[PDB]
């Protein structure tokens, strides 16, 4: 079992976590394409990483998500953190801590790709 002496300044880190809850300036990628660089709050949550990003319905929509295709998304508040991985089947979110890059993936069935 790993140990970190608090006097140097922690259970999460001792358990393999890389980054604690907080707001971080990250590069946001969607389906492996660069989208933006801005602050994103990461809260404690069910994830191998221990933290999950907080992005709103409007933020996701502006990047390509078709909110009308997501069941129950209309019930969310404007400022609610979208539970992406559960609300959008097989959508994923992973933060590459070293690069401070938030990689988001959303299935095509939920993207605004209708013939225009």
């Amino acid at each position: 079992d790993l140990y970190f002496n608090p006097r140097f300044l922690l259970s999460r880190f001792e358990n393999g976590q890389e980054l604690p809850p907080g707001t971080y300036r990250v590069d946001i990628y969607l389906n492996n394409g660069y989208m933006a660089t801005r602050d994103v709050t990461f809260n404690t949550g069910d994830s191998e990483q221990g933290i999950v990003p907080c992005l709103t319905r409007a933020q996701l929509a502006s990047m390509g998500l078709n909110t009308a295709s997501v069941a129950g998304m209309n019930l969310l508040a404007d400022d609610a953190c979208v539970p992406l991985t559960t609300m959008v089947q097989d959508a994923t979110a992973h933060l590459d801590v070293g690069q401070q890059r938030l990689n988001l993936t959303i299935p095509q069935a939920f993207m605004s790709n209708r013939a225009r």
Binding site: D1, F8, Q17, T37
Partner: protein
């Protein structure tokens, strides 16, 4: 151990951010990296933000720190401002060691963070040559009339080696001078790229 990718960071005014690489060269080790900014007085200061301020690095890998301008345009616009970046590598150890006698060492790298205004009067490659000197009984004063901090090293007076100095923009710094030190002064500087510049002959004011 853990090493930084640069020995200083020149932050151009207007830039959204600047980066600093942090590399853990120890494959079997996990470190907690704590970083913070201090002002010229060595006091923790928030005018520049370093993020992530606390994270763990497991094994050999490279992590990038982002440095953000949070000065709200309040810093002088005719000269550089000095800040310090601090990156501390905190080691871990097995909890089984808690019943033993131990000494843990945290390694800290401290480098300069220079805020550099845009459109400065003098080009940076012309600054080092502008340094001037004023000699006193037992002291030597370095005169920096440029908008750039001058890191003076290998400062010699005769055959005597004097203390290194960090001369502030449009300012001065003083170092002790042995009474027997020669009058012939020579010096070198550490430039924007952390390189030692060729020896220059000291010119008196």
């Amino acid at each position: 151990g853990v090493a930084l990718g640069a020995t200083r960071v020149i932050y151009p005014a207007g830039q959204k951010q600047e980066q600093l690489a942090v590399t853990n060269n120890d494959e079997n080790s996990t470190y907690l990296i704590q970083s913070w900014v201090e002002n010229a007085d060595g006091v923790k200061d928030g005018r520049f933000i370093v993020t992530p301020p606390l994270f763990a690095m497991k094994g050999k890998k490279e992590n990038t720190l982002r440095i953000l301008d949070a000065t709200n345009n309040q810093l002088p616009q005719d000269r550089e401002s000095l800040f310090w970046m601090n990156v501390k590598a905190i080691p871990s150890m097995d909890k089984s060691k808690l019943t033993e006698n131990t000494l843990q060492l945290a390694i800290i790298s401290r480098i300069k963070l220079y805020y550099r205004p845009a459109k400065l009067a003098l080009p940076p490659d012309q600054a080092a040559e502008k340094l001037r000197f004023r000699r006193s009984a037992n002291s030597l004063t370095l005169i920096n009339p440029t908008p750039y901090y001058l890191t003076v090293t290998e400062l010699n007076a005769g055959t005597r080696v004097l203390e290194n100095a960090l001369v502030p923009p449009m300012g001065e710094s003083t170092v002790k001078l042995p009474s027997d030190a020669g009058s012939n002064i020579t010096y070198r500087t550490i430039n924007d790229y952390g390189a030692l510049t060729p020896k220059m002959t000291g010119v008196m004011e």
